[PDB]
């Protein structure tokens, strides 16, 4: 019988518990730790992937290229606070031009 | 030397500007994307723009390269956007919000009010034709009946004397925004018969334009359009009565009685009026029920020499007047 | 064409939209080979591995440039200068 | 050998375009090459340390990411 | 004082909010700012030029997308009945003609931008773009917005509804 | 028909379509040596199809 | 020589049978006859032997 459906989450819980048990983070763990971790990873993954899909439909492309993920992570501010010193392969950079460097004439 | 194209694109000073606006859902027309038999129903009620029956023009506008239309215009043999034998409604005096099939049998309206008119008049003979209403969703008025080209193609059927209607819902007769509870309603699967009762020869008044500058010819970007436009405030004041002045809204033989009388004197076009999205099939001609009495509504879509000769005939048909007119 | 400074904006925007690498494969690979030979001899590299390093470089490098940029703005000028690069390197806390 | 000249003018020009500049001096390339060389040697020191500790004379990609993580940066999408 | 009849009787007013206080990047994806971060920078208060107005408690500088104007978009045939009903109910000339073929009626349906005024010394100019195949009108500013001023755009009518604003350059008319 | 309620050019383009079309085509492309009987037969061949 | 490269077919019919067609179209547009074949034949016989 399964264990992920007991809480209705999607990320595995048995896998998390086994990997944390063999990860020697401590010697003895409770029962709510694996389900709680599965839940928080679920929430963070959903938070990122919703913006990923929004960026995918921005350019009208079904497949999500990593550029979309880069834009979605960078344009948000809380992510930029949490993903401070992290880069992305093939990610690129969001467009930006300094304000005072903008020529004009009549 | 490159300002002529910009003048042709902005609009110039030849009457109406060279920037079309037909923002409702316009379809079933404008097939060949080049200088060939074309049509542009315009937002402005009363603008008919067509390219079939072509014509040459004077070359050398501003001493640029010699234009190919100097004395020997390029030929054309392809699809022509109209009908000859018996126009199933029309393709010229229409609103740019009506969806018609390629064979021109079904009529689908806009989110708002819409109509289709025809291009064939009736003076004598039997024209016992039918309009099979395929379906009629709620809040989709399906008033059908004859009308006049002077009628505003977006005005409600019956709003002006040019147009005559019988309401599909509750059968309440409506004309000039005046309503009387008269008959019973119609709708889904209800074929509307229509036989304008003038088997005997009559007399009417056809044309009396009031404007000329809006009737001009100039290249839009790569093709010509014929600004054949109607007016309103002058046409409505030339309103007259005529013989067999009764637009009867039958029910395929059975008739509730002609709703409104004293119809406008002029060329009659059977107008089908929709109010929302709804399809409807048609069968018009000098017949009773079967469409194939004359040639069965030829589309003139063939590659043989018949298309070539008919296109050249139309070219000459307009060439006679483009030669005898004298261009400004 | 003419009017210098106009083409720069078009180029920079075009490249800002794009997201490709900027260093030719073979020269960078040979340079990594040389700097590895400096440490130890006869090291077999994974084609995936080199690529890896490559990307990281630009990341680091581009960040540095941006910083120098604003430093030039602090000096009432547009052109960036070497001295600004040492400015950024020292002020970042990585000397 | 001499390959530091391999990173030529147009490439560093394009990466300056990445940075957000248009006006750059002609005497900036040498110290950029120096900074780049310093970064590469600093990373590859830890890289070769990792690859030789595991007794494998080859160099993989996952250890490169490992050294990048230990240094202070982090790389995503590779291993 | 309940014994003397004071004048200015007829009003024909609809938005009964008139008070004497009035205490005030690529293109397609910018849609979010229209619906979420566009409800604080502008307040609704009593305009000094004429009638009601959209005063300001925030600041917005040049070249900044601000508001999308939406209303009951109709064709030009409904203009006749609409003007007749405007005369009947006492409705102003809300015939917002984006083009000669489609007009944005604002008497049965409309947005908060129905509160604008007209003057020959305005603060903003109009602009229109196309997103996802649909033409939408979004305004980009040319200067900075101060706290306590009213948005107004030039109608650009080529030279009888007077335009009473009091500005020196005010042509006193829609022209 | 053909007099008042049917415009002259509209009558040409609407009612008698299959007769003058074929005659004009044959006299502009084929031109038989004796076209009088051809045009007479074509005119008589359309008698209960158009009013 | 007819309609190969020199004279376009539309231009050919606009430049080869004019003196009969303009009269025919004028009489069908003004005299409005249901049977205008007689007029066309009469104007064709006027230049039957005059056709270059
Ligand atoms: N200062 C002014 N004086 C008179 N009419 C004005 C005006 N400014 C705008 N209008 C007209 O009023 C119409 C919009 S209704 C006016 C906005 C709103 N009712 C309010 O209270 O402010 C526009 O068509 C415009 O032509
Ligand atoms: Zn003023």
PDB file of N, CA, C and O in Angstrom, chain B residues 35-37 54 56 69 71-76 206 308-309 311-313 315-320 323-324, chain G residues 3 5-18 20-26 28-30 32:
ATOM      1  N   UNK B  35      -3.674  41.781 -57.575  1.00  0.00           N
ATOM      2  CA  UNK B  35      -4.505  42.637 -58.402  1.00  0.00           C
ATOM      3  C   UNK B  35      -5.444  41.874 -59.312  1.00  0.00           C
ATOM      4  O   UNK B  35      -5.211  41.777 -60.521  1.00  0.00           O
ATOM      5  N   UNK B  36      -6.517  41.334 -58.739  1.00  0.00           N
ATOM      6  CA  UNK B  36      -7.455  40.464 -59.437  1.00  0.00           C
ATOM      7  C   UNK B  36      -8.872  40.793 -58.974  1.00  0.00           C
ATOM      8  O   UNK B  36      -9.040  41.685 -58.135  1.00  0.00           O
ATOM      9  N   UNK B  37      -9.926  40.139 -59.516  1.00  0.00           N
ATOM     10  CA  UNK B  37     -11.281  40.398 -59.004  1.00  0.00           C
ATOM     11  C   UNK B  37     -11.381  40.291 -57.490  1.00  0.00           C
ATOM     12  O   UNK B  37     -11.278  39.200 -56.921  1.00  0.00           O
ATOM     13  N   UNK B  54     -11.623  44.953 -64.951  1.00  0.00           N
ATOM     14  CA  UNK B  54     -10.477  45.855 -64.751  1.00  0.00           C
ATOM     15  C   UNK B  54     -10.385  46.982 -65.771  1.00  0.00           C
ATOM     16  O   UNK B  54     -11.242  47.112 -66.650  1.00  0.00           O
ATOM     17  N   UNK B  56      -7.233  50.026 -67.531  1.00  0.00           N
ATOM     18  CA  UNK B  56      -5.891  50.619 -67.524  1.00  0.00           C
ATOM     19  C   UNK B  56      -5.923  52.018 -66.911  1.00  0.00           C
ATOM     20  O   UNK B  56      -6.966  52.516 -66.493  1.00  0.00           O
ATOM     21  N   UNK B  69       1.043  49.257 -66.853  1.00  0.00           N
ATOM     22  CA  UNK B  69      -0.333  49.574 -67.217  1.00  0.00           C
ATOM     23  C   UNK B  69      -0.434  50.791 -68.128  1.00  0.00           C
ATOM     24  O   UNK B  69      -1.438  51.514 -68.080  1.00  0.00           O
ATOM     25  N   UNK B  71      -0.295  51.130 -71.812  1.00  0.00           N
ATOM     26  CA  UNK B  71      -1.265  50.876 -72.858  1.00  0.00           C
ATOM     27  C   UNK B  71      -1.663  49.418 -72.944  1.00  0.00           C
ATOM     28  O   UNK B  71      -2.701  49.082 -73.522  1.00  0.00           O
ATOM     29  N   UNK B  72      -0.845  48.544 -72.362  1.00  0.00           N
ATOM     30  CA  UNK B  72      -1.037  47.095 -72.429  1.00  0.00           C
ATOM     31  C   UNK B  72      -1.066  46.544 -71.011  1.00  0.00           C
ATOM     32  O   UNK B  72      -0.037  46.108 -70.477  1.00  0.00           O
ATOM     33  N   UNK B  73      -2.231  46.552 -70.368  1.00  0.00           N
ATOM     34  CA  UNK B  73      -2.324  46.020 -69.004  1.00  0.00           C
ATOM     35  C   UNK B  73      -2.087  44.520 -68.972  1.00  0.00           C
ATOM     36  O   UNK B  73      -2.348  43.802 -69.942  1.00  0.00           O
ATOM     37  N   UNK B  74      -1.579  44.050 -67.839  1.00  0.00           N
ATOM     38  CA  UNK B  74      -1.357  42.611 -67.656  1.00  0.00           C
ATOM     39  C   UNK B  74      -2.701  41.894 -67.655  1.00  0.00           C
ATOM     40  O   UNK B  74      -3.697  42.456 -67.165  1.00  0.00           O
ATOM     41  N   UNK B  75      -2.792  40.684 -68.188  1.00  0.00           N
ATOM     42  CA  UNK B  75      -4.069  39.967 -68.220  1.00  0.00           C
ATOM     43  C   UNK B  75      -4.372  39.326 -66.869  1.00  0.00           C
ATOM     44  O   UNK B  75      -3.565  39.350 -65.942  1.00  0.00           O
ATOM     45  N   UNK B  76      -5.567  38.752 -66.772  1.00  0.00           N
ATOM     46  CA  UNK B  76      -5.967  38.028 -65.582  1.00  0.00           C
ATOM     47  C   UNK B  76      -6.994  36.953 -65.870  1.00  0.00           C
ATOM     48  O   UNK B  76      -8.037  37.229 -66.468  1.00  0.00           O
ATOM     49  N   UNK B 206     -34.078  53.933 -60.137  1.00  0.00           N
ATOM     50  CA  UNK B 206     -32.910  53.163 -59.727  1.00  0.00           C
ATOM     51  C   UNK B 206     -31.826  54.020 -59.087  1.00  0.00           C
ATOM     52  O   UNK B 206     -31.481  53.807 -57.923  1.00  0.00           O
ATOM     53  N   UNK B 308     -11.185  32.733 -69.132  1.00  0.00           N
ATOM     54  CA  UNK B 308     -10.414  33.780 -69.797  1.00  0.00           C
ATOM     55  C   UNK B 308     -11.339  34.698 -70.585  1.00  0.00           C
ATOM     56  O   UNK B 308     -11.246  35.929 -70.497  1.00  0.00           O
ATOM     57  N   UNK B 309     -12.254  34.113 -71.363  1.00  0.00           N
ATOM     58  CA  UNK B 309     -13.122  34.936 -72.199  1.00  0.00           C
ATOM     59  C   UNK B 309     -14.102  35.731 -71.347  1.00  0.00           C
ATOM     60  O   UNK B 309     -14.396  36.889 -71.660  1.00  0.00           O
ATOM     61  N   UNK B 311     -13.569  36.809 -68.236  1.00  0.00           N
ATOM     62  CA  UNK B 311     -12.801  37.873 -67.603  1.00  0.00           C
ATOM     63  C   UNK B 311     -12.487  38.988 -68.590  1.00  0.00           C
ATOM     64  O   UNK B 311     -12.557  40.170 -68.240  1.00  0.00           O
ATOM     65  N   UNK B 312     -12.138  38.634 -69.830  1.00  0.00           N
ATOM     66  CA  UNK B 312     -11.900  39.661 -70.839  1.00  0.00           C
ATOM     67  C   UNK B 312     -13.180  40.411 -71.184  1.00  0.00           C
ATOM     68  O   UNK B 312     -13.139  41.621 -71.433  1.00  0.00           O
ATOM     69  N   UNK B 313     -14.320  39.717 -71.193  1.00  0.00           N
ATOM     70  CA  UNK B 313     -15.596  40.381 -71.430  1.00  0.00           C
ATOM     71  C   UNK B 313     -15.881  41.409 -70.343  1.00  0.00           C
ATOM     72  O   UNK B 313     -16.306  42.531 -70.632  1.00  0.00           O
ATOM     73  N   UNK B 315     -13.589  42.844 -68.447  1.00  0.00           N
ATOM     74  CA  UNK B 315     -12.582  43.880 -68.637  1.00  0.00           C
ATOM     75  C   UNK B 315     -13.039  44.898 -69.670  1.00  0.00           C
ATOM     76  O   UNK B 315     -12.949  46.105 -69.437  1.00  0.00           O
ATOM     77  N   UNK B 316     -13.561  44.429 -70.805  1.00  0.00           N
ATOM     78  CA  UNK B 316     -14.092  45.336 -71.820  1.00  0.00           C
ATOM     79  C   UNK B 316     -15.325  46.070 -71.304  1.00  0.00           C
ATOM     80  O   UNK B 316     -15.532  47.259 -71.598  1.00  0.00           O
ATOM     81  N   UNK B 317     -16.166  45.372 -70.535  1.00  0.00           N
ATOM     82  CA  UNK B 317     -17.391  45.962 -70.012  1.00  0.00           C
ATOM     83  C   UNK B 317     -17.092  47.208 -69.197  1.00  0.00           C
ATOM     84  O   UNK B 317     -17.843  48.190 -69.247  1.00  0.00           O
ATOM     85  N   UNK B 318     -16.004  47.188 -68.433  1.00  0.00           N
ATOM     86  CA  UNK B 318     -15.627  48.410 -67.731  1.00  0.00           C
ATOM     87  C   UNK B 318     -14.691  49.293 -68.555  1.00  0.00           C
ATOM     88  O   UNK B 318     -14.616  50.507 -68.306  1.00  0.00           O
ATOM     89  N   UNK B 319     -13.997  48.713 -69.538  1.00  0.00           N
ATOM     90  CA  UNK B 319     -13.046  49.465 -70.346  1.00  0.00           C
ATOM     91  C   UNK B 319     -13.748  50.489 -71.220  1.00  0.00           C
ATOM     92  O   UNK B 319     -13.210  51.575 -71.466  1.00  0.00           O
ATOM     93  N   UNK B 320     -14.953  50.164 -71.691  1.00  0.00           N
ATOM     94  CA  UNK B 320     -15.685  51.106 -72.536  1.00  0.00           C
ATOM     95  C   UNK B 320     -15.890  52.429 -71.801  1.00  0.00           C
ATOM     96  O   UNK B 320     -15.594  53.509 -72.331  1.00  0.00           O
ATOM     97  N   UNK B 323     -12.669  54.382 -70.895  1.00  0.00           N
ATOM     98  CA  UNK B 323     -12.143  55.122 -72.038  1.00  0.00           C
ATOM     99  C   UNK B 323     -12.997  56.346 -72.350  1.00  0.00           C
ATOM    100  O   UNK B 323     -12.465  57.438 -72.576  1.00  0.00           O
ATOM    101  N   UNK B 324     -14.326  56.187 -72.368  1.00  0.00           N
ATOM    102  CA  UNK B 324     -15.189  57.306 -72.750  1.00  0.00           C
ATOM    103  C   UNK B 324     -15.411  58.304 -71.626  1.00  0.00           C
ATOM    104  O   UNK B 324     -16.033  59.348 -71.856  1.00  0.00           O
TER     105      UNK B 324
ATOM    106  N   UNK G   3      -2.319  36.618 -78.500  1.00  0.00           N
ATOM    107  CA  UNK G   3      -2.167  36.259 -77.090  1.00  0.00           C
ATOM    108  C   UNK G   3      -1.096  35.190 -76.874  1.00  0.00           C
ATOM    109  O   UNK G   3      -1.370  34.090 -76.391  1.00  0.00           O
ATOM    110  N   UNK G   5       2.830  36.507 -76.344  1.00  0.00           N
ATOM    111  CA  UNK G   5       3.579  37.374 -75.437  1.00  0.00           C
ATOM    112  C   UNK G   5       3.370  38.860 -75.684  1.00  0.00           C
ATOM    113  O   UNK G   5       3.582  39.651 -74.758  1.00  0.00           O
ATOM    114  N   UNK G   6       2.953  39.276 -76.881  1.00  0.00           N
ATOM    115  CA  UNK G   6       2.939  40.694 -77.219  1.00  0.00           C
ATOM    116  C   UNK G   6       1.696  41.392 -76.680  1.00  0.00           C
ATOM    117  O   UNK G   6       1.801  42.346 -75.901  1.00  0.00           O
ATOM    118  N   UNK G   7       0.517  40.935 -77.080  1.00  0.00           N
ATOM    119  CA  UNK G   7      -0.735  41.581 -76.696  1.00  0.00           C
ATOM    120  C   UNK G   7      -1.446  40.740 -75.648  1.00  0.00           C
ATOM    121  O   UNK G   7      -1.866  39.606 -75.950  1.00  0.00           O
ATOM    122  N   UNK G   8      -1.593  41.228 -74.416  1.00  0.00           N
ATOM    123  CA  UNK G   8      -2.327  40.463 -73.402  1.00  0.00           C
ATOM    124  C   UNK G   8      -3.779  40.259 -73.806  1.00  0.00           C
ATOM    125  O   UNK G   8      -4.372  41.085 -74.501  1.00  0.00           O
ATOM    126  N   UNK G   9      -4.346  39.137 -73.355  1.00  0.00           N
ATOM    127  CA  UNK G   9      -5.688  38.749 -73.783  1.00  0.00           C
ATOM    128  C   UNK G   9      -6.717  39.812 -73.418  1.00  0.00           C
ATOM    129  O   UNK G   9      -7.579  40.165 -74.232  1.00  0.00           O
ATOM    130  N   UNK G  10      -6.645  40.334 -72.191  1.00  0.00           N
ATOM    131  CA  UNK G  10      -7.514  41.446 -71.825  1.00  0.00           C
ATOM    132  C   UNK G  10      -7.229  42.665 -72.693  1.00  0.00           C
ATOM    133  O   UNK G  10      -8.154  43.295 -73.219  1.00  0.00           O
ATOM    134  N   UNK G  11      -5.948  42.989 -72.886  1.00  0.00           N
ATOM    135  CA  UNK G  11      -5.594  44.076 -73.792  1.00  0.00           C
ATOM    136  C   UNK G  11      -5.965  43.734 -75.230  1.00  0.00           C
ATOM    137  O   UNK G  11      -6.327  44.619 -76.013  1.00  0.00           O
ATOM    138  N   UNK G  12      -5.887  42.453 -75.595  1.00  0.00           N
ATOM    139  CA  UNK G  12      -6.274  42.050 -76.944  1.00  0.00           C
ATOM    140  C   UNK G  12      -7.742  42.355 -77.204  1.00  0.00           C
ATOM    141  O   UNK G  12      -8.089  42.966 -78.220  1.00  0.00           O
ATOM    142  N   UNK G  13      -8.624  41.942 -76.291  1.00  0.00           N
ATOM    143  CA  UNK G  13     -10.040  42.236 -76.460  1.00  0.00           C
ATOM    144  C   UNK G  13     -10.359  43.704 -76.211  1.00  0.00           C
ATOM    145  O   UNK G  13     -11.424  44.173 -76.626  1.00  0.00           O
ATOM    146  N   UNK G  14      -9.466  44.434 -75.544  1.00  0.00           N
ATOM    147  CA  UNK G  14      -9.613  45.876 -75.405  1.00  0.00           C
ATOM    148  C   UNK G  14      -9.095  46.647 -76.611  1.00  0.00           C
ATOM    149  O   UNK G  14      -9.323  47.858 -76.690  1.00  0.00           O
ATOM    150  N   UNK G  15      -8.375  45.993 -77.524  1.00  0.00           N
ATOM    151  CA  UNK G  15      -7.793  46.681 -78.667  1.00  0.00           C
ATOM    152  C   UNK G  15      -8.059  46.038 -80.023  1.00  0.00           C
ATOM    153  O   UNK G  15      -7.484  46.500 -81.017  1.00  0.00           O
ATOM    154  N   UNK G  16      -8.888  44.996 -80.114  1.00  0.00           N
ATOM    155  CA  UNK G  16      -9.078  44.332 -81.400  1.00  0.00           C
ATOM    156  C   UNK G  16     -10.503  44.373 -81.938  1.00  0.00           C
ATOM    157  O   UNK G  16     -10.681  44.317 -83.155  1.00  0.00           O
ATOM    158  N   UNK G  17     -11.522  44.472 -81.084  1.00  0.00           N
ATOM    159  CA  UNK G  17     -12.901  44.459 -81.566  1.00  0.00           C
ATOM    160  C   UNK G  17     -13.686  45.627 -80.981  1.00  0.00           C
ATOM    161  O   UNK G  17     -14.912  45.552 -80.838  1.00  0.00           O
ATOM    162  N   UNK G  18     -12.986  46.718 -80.652  1.00  0.00           N
ATOM    163  CA  UNK G  18     -13.639  47.861 -80.005  1.00  0.00           C
ATOM    164  C   UNK G  18     -14.817  48.410 -80.807  1.00  0.00           C
ATOM    165  O   UNK G  18     -15.925  48.507 -80.247  1.00  0.00           O
ATOM    166  N   UNK G  20     -17.186  47.634 -82.497  1.00  0.00           N
ATOM    167  CA  UNK G  20     -18.461  46.936 -82.407  1.00  0.00           C
ATOM    168  C   UNK G  20     -18.920  46.825 -80.959  1.00  0.00           C
ATOM    169  O   UNK G  20     -20.092  47.054 -80.644  1.00  0.00           O
ATOM    170  N   UNK G  21     -17.991  46.499 -80.059  1.00  0.00           N
ATOM    171  CA  UNK G  21     -18.340  46.289 -78.661  1.00  0.00           C
ATOM    172  C   UNK G  21     -18.801  47.562 -77.966  1.00  0.00           C
ATOM    173  O   UNK G  21     -19.688  47.488 -77.108  1.00  0.00           O
ATOM    174  N   UNK G  22     -18.225  48.730 -78.279  1.00  0.00           N
ATOM    175  CA  UNK G  22     -18.693  49.902 -77.536  1.00  0.00           C
ATOM    176  C   UNK G  22     -20.143  50.208 -77.892  1.00  0.00           C
ATOM    177  O   UNK G  22     -20.952  50.511 -77.008  1.00  0.00           O
ATOM    178  N   UNK G  23     -20.495  50.097 -79.177  1.00  0.00           N
ATOM    179  CA  UNK G  23     -21.883  50.278 -79.586  1.00  0.00           C
ATOM    180  C   UNK G  23     -22.789  49.219 -78.969  1.00  0.00           C
ATOM    181  O   UNK G  23     -23.904  49.528 -78.533  1.00  0.00           O
ATOM    182  N   UNK G  24     -22.337  47.962 -78.935  1.00  0.00           N
ATOM    183  CA  UNK G  24     -23.166  46.916 -78.354  1.00  0.00           C
ATOM    184  C   UNK G  24     -23.452  47.146 -76.880  1.00  0.00           C
ATOM    185  O   UNK G  24     -24.596  47.034 -76.426  1.00  0.00           O
ATOM    186  N   UNK G  25     -22.414  47.485 -76.113  1.00  0.00           N
ATOM    187  CA  UNK G  25     -22.613  47.761 -74.695  1.00  0.00           C
ATOM    188  C   UNK G  25     -23.469  49.005 -74.490  1.00  0.00           C
ATOM    189  O   UNK G  25     -24.319  49.036 -73.594  1.00  0.00           O
ATOM    190  N   UNK G  26     -23.276  50.035 -75.320  1.00  0.00           N
ATOM    191  CA  UNK G  26     -24.084  51.242 -75.187  1.00  0.00           C
ATOM    192  C   UNK G  26     -25.556  50.959 -75.454  1.00  0.00           C
ATOM    193  O   UNK G  26     -26.430  51.464 -74.740  1.00  0.00           O
ATOM    194  N   UNK G  28     -27.101  48.024 -75.184  1.00  0.00           N
ATOM    195  CA  UNK G  28     -27.675  47.196 -74.126  1.00  0.00           C
ATOM    196  C   UNK G  28     -27.784  47.948 -72.804  1.00  0.00           C
ATOM    197  O   UNK G  28     -28.536  47.517 -71.924  1.00  0.00           O
ATOM    198  N   UNK G  29     -27.055  49.054 -72.645  1.00  0.00           N
ATOM    199  CA  UNK G  29     -27.157  49.861 -71.437  1.00  0.00           C
ATOM    200  C   UNK G  29     -28.190  50.975 -71.542  1.00  0.00           C
ATOM    201  O   UNK G  29     -28.678  51.445 -70.508  1.00  0.00           O
ATOM    202  N   UNK G  30     -28.531  51.409 -72.754  1.00  0.00           N
ATOM    203  CA  UNK G  30     -29.534  52.444 -72.970  1.00  0.00           C
ATOM    204  C   UNK G  30     -30.807  51.908 -73.607  1.00  0.00           C
ATOM    205  O   UNK G  30     -31.897  52.080 -73.053  1.00  0.00           O
ATOM    206  N   UNK G  32     -31.613  48.913 -73.813  1.00  0.00           N
ATOM    207  CA  UNK G  32     -32.010  47.792 -72.964  1.00  0.00           C
ATOM    208  C   UNK G  32     -32.819  46.692 -73.667  1.00  0.00           C
ATOM    209  O   UNK G  32     -33.922  46.354 -73.235  1.00  0.00           O
TER     210      UNK G  32
END
